[PDB]
């Protein structure tokens, strides 16, 4: 028998002690080797109540990724409310690696396997595991990248959908390549997406969203206000910071039939996603900077009000990167033996 509980977890990885890539350096000294013989356990004829919006695994992954980025990235200058330190800012190697989250002694993780689970309801076929799967800690905005795909249907996740201050996550059946590239002025880059693929996927997402909002019509709009990391799709490709204008992806007129290319830019000064302050980087490296990623999640915020109108609008971007972890951690739940 088990009860719900919260305890300190630890992490597991396949990191190399000799690598200079920054995630491997963090993961050899913060994590242990992956379970050499893992095996899951069915919990026959048992039901449990998962709730992906109050999971402490998420807070712990947040603190972990913060520590990793705090030691890992080397800006020339870091400014944090009056204080500003200046340090050597060498280039770094950077490519996220999958991380598992293991329970300590006297606890175990439960796994919701209901193919179309929405993160909050009860669960049919519950499993017991030692660790999570390999979760890649990739901070990004608007788009969720290099994650996992929904088993059967596209799934729409929120705390309530009738609250507009609470983020909504959409999990796709089918990943869509975003092929970002800076070719061999030095900051202008561009992200490319197969327009036919992406627009079919977006029509399917519209159909689901109409399913949950009373058949009502829905439309997409660019983000309304705030700093660049919200208004545009921001991410990190090999130490450089990409900012891409995503408006051509949320193109209602074309629910385009070829290649969409987003104007991306590499930025020298950024605001740290840890809420901390702003940091200055060194000019980008030379050569072809490539980044082929899977789009396997979107985050939306619904325009408040307009309960009068016969349509609902949705803009990309949802709060702070903690929820990205939810995107993968939704199906787990640590309990006390």
């Amino acid at each position, epitope marked *: 028998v088990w009860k719900d509980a919260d305890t300190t977890l630890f992490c597991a990885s396949d990191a190399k002690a000799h690598e200079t890539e920054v995630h491997n350096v963090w993961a050899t000294h913060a994590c242990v080797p992956t379970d050499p013989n893992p095996q899951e356990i069915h919990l026959e004829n048992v039901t449990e109540n998962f709730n992906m919006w109050k999971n402490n695994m998420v807070e712990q992954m947040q603190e972990d990724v913060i520590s990793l980025w705090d030691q890992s990235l080397q800006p020339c200058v870091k400014l944090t409310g009056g204080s500003v330190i200046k340090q050597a800012c060498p280039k770094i190697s950077f490519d996220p690696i999958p991380i598992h989250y293991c329970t300590p002694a006297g606890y175990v993780i439960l796994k919701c396997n209901d193919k179309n689970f929405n993160g909050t309801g009860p669960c049919k076929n519950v499993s017991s595991v030692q660790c999570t799967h390999g979760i890649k800690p990739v901070v990004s905005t608007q788009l969720l990248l290099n994650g996992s795909l929904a088993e059967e249907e596209i799934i729409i996740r929120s705390e309530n959908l009738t*609250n507009n*201050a609470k983020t909504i996550i959409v999990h796709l059946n089918k990943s869509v390549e975003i092929n970002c590239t800076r070719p061999s002025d030095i900051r202008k880059a561009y992200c490319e997406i197969n327009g036919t693929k992406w627009n079919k996927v977006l029509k399917q997402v519209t159909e689901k969203l109409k399913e949950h909002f009373n058949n009502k019509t829905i439309i997409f709009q660019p983000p309304s206000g705030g700093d660049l990391e*919200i208004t545009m799709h921001s991410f990190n490709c090999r130490g450089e910071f990409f900012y891409c204008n995503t408006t051509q992806l949320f193109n209602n007129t074309c629910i385009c039939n070829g290649t969409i290319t987003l104007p991306c830019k590499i930025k020298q000064i950024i605001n740290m996603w840890q809420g901390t302050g702003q940091a200055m980087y060194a000019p980008p490296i030379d050569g072809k900077i490539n980044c082929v990623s899977n789009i396997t999640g979107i985050l939306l915020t619904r325009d408040g*009000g*307009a309960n009068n109108t016969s349509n609902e609008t949705f803009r990309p*971007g949802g*709060g702070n990167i903690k929820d990205n972890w939810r995107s993968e951690l939704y199906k787990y739940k640590v309990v006390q033996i």
Partner: antibody
Amino acid sequence: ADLVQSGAVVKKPGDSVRISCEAQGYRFPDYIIHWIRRAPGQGPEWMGWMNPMGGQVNIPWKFQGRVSMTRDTSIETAFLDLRGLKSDDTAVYYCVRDRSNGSGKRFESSNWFLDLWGRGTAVTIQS
Amino acid sequence: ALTQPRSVSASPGQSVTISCTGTHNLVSWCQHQPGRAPKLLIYDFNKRPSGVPDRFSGSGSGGTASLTITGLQDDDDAEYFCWAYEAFGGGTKLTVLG
């Protein structure tokens, strides 16, 4: 712990107004901030919420373009901006702190949790 | 957006009930003394925070929500407002009849 609002003012039609909200006694970066409106002879009217971490805003159609909710985490102050004032904009505006939403340990409220309230700033449109 | 009557009144010791009609979402309540900063009283129908007395309470189901203040005092004379997300009540002036 309170939200200090700026003093009352008068304006002319058209025109535009800026109002502050200096947060005190808590972590301004966490918990979003709603701006609400009370006009003479009408019930309270919400104008939008603003996440002070990144500055993201959620604003209903009635006020698109005409309003902007900004902030300056350096001195923990929110800001409301209204352009092109008419008569129906004459009102008292409050900044208010939600605490069931944002980053940080939220309060646990399924509805909106309007914890902390400013004292109000009156703008009068003297046409 | 949400109805709410305009006036309540009672005398230093009895009990009153303000209500908010509208639609079936959860409602929180707020007291607003003349010109002061409003104060959260009770949230999510019946739940009550801390710093606020047991006399204030509430509930709700069927379309309308109720907020009750028992054992009134000469400092409860203020306006009261309710909300369900961004649907707002018009307000209710509470008069303590002297």
